[PDB]
Design a protein around this ligand. Structure first.
Ligand code: NA
Ligand code: NA
Ligand code: NA
Ligand code: NA
Ligand code: NA
Length: 157
């Protein structure tokens, strides 16, 4: 049922969160986890996406899931973004792109006469046993959080 195999070490990577604590993916064993990668704090698309997930948080709570947003912005940036927007879930400051590389969300584009690497907006659903059971890549924000919730409900049943 896995759609993506992560390196075993991924699950023990210390993930720096907004608010100054750390988590790991293994620490989330026992419940569903939505991991959404976004390119940049405090931009229109990324703010819309975060607010959409935030508005649905009680539905994720019903269904036994936690949410983590991920970008490579700093903890301080994340703290500002969370405070301004009122997010009630954490943001991972993946400053070294360790988590991004594990999920293969750093994508290359031929532009400006060069090879340019950047975060591709992408979301994943991790089962209570740490399996990646659904992936969305090159995400369109509109309708996305709703679609992720619907997929979670389908998988969790
Ligand atoms: Na840290
Ligand atoms: Na860190
Ligand atoms: Na810390
Ligand atoms: Na999990
Ligand atoms: Na998919």
């Amino acid at each position: 049922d896995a759609v993506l195999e992560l390196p075993a070490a991924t699950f023990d990577l210390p993930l720096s969160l907004s608010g100054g604590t750390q988590t790991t993916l293994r620490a989330h064993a026992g419940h569903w986890l939505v991991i959404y990668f976004y390119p940049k704090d405090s931009t229109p698309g990324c703010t819309t996406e975060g607010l959409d997930f935030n508005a649905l948080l009680p539905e994720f709570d019903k269904a036994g899931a936690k949410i983590l947003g991920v970008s490579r912005d700093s903890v301080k940036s994340h703290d500002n973004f969370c405070a301004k927007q009122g997010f009630a879930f954490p943001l991972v400051s993946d400053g070294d792109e360790a988590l991004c590389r594990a999920f293969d969300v750093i994508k290359e584009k031929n532009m400006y006469g060069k090879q340019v690497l950047g975060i591709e907006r992408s979301t994943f659903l991790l089962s209570p046993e740490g399996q990646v059971v659904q992936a969305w890549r090159k995400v369109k924000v509109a309708g996305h959080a709703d679609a992720v919730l619907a997929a979670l409900k389908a998988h969790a049943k």
